[PDB]
């Protein structure tokens, strides 16, 4: 930025940091507004052979839901919807603020 050396020093002292390192106004460090043309990739289904839609058809593999039990239609162990969630580990990066 454009600032006098006195003003920069006063700003640094008042805020207790080096503001010139982290500036909130953008000075020529950003990308140019004109860029070279791109050339994007195609994808996995852009082959000329071995590419039949019936083998890569997601929607047609959807099924009606499976009827586990219907009213119309040994000692079993009690079950749970899923295994119990594991206890979280305290962060190694910074456990406390």
């Amino acid at each position: 930025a454009s600032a006098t050396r006195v003003i920069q020093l006063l700003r640094n002292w008042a805020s207790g940091r080096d503001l010139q390192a982290k500036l909130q106004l953008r000075y020529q460090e950003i990308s140019k507004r004109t860029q070279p043309p791109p050339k994007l990739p195609v994808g996995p289904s852009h082959k000329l052979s071995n590419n039949y839609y019936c083998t890569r058809d997601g929607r047609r593999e959807a099924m009606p839901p499976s009827i586990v039990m219907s009213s119309q239609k040994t000692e079993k162990k009690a079950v749970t919807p899923a295994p119990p969630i594991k206890r979280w580990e305290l962060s190694k990066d910074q456990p406390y603020l």
Partner: protein, 112 residues
């Protein structure tokens, strides 16, 4: 022994083992009033005996929390209380009876 449970409104219990034993015994006593063939009775009796056996075999609180996998011992006590209340209500509701009524002919048919 610990200062906080980390959860607002959940206080540390000084005597977790005694409270858990009391609660599990009370739960088992309530389950005795349910018909023997009820599926509810067998399952919750099984899991209560499973949990009650651990509280009588592990005197260390951290090891007991590890074995129960219920979070913290205060959470375990709260869940035992919830289970006891549910057992009383189920004794009142009696859900082991056959189905109340079947739905109409096409009540769950989809798409429609």
């Amino acid at each position: 022994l610990k200062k906080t449970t980390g959860l607002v409104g959940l206080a540390v219990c000084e005597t977790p083992h005694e409270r858990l034993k009391i609660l599990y015994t009370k739960i088992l006593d309530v389950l005795g009033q349910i018909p023997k063939n009820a599926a509810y009775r067998k399952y919750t009796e099984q899991i209560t005996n499973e949990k009650l056996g651990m509280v009588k075999a592990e005197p260390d609180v951290k090891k007991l929390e590890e074995q129960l996998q219920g979070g913290q011992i205060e959470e375990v006590i709260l869940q035992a209380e919830n289970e006891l209340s549910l057992a009383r209500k189920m004794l009142r509701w009696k859900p082991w009876e056959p189905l109340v009524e079947e739905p109409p002919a096409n009540q769950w048919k989809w798409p429609i």
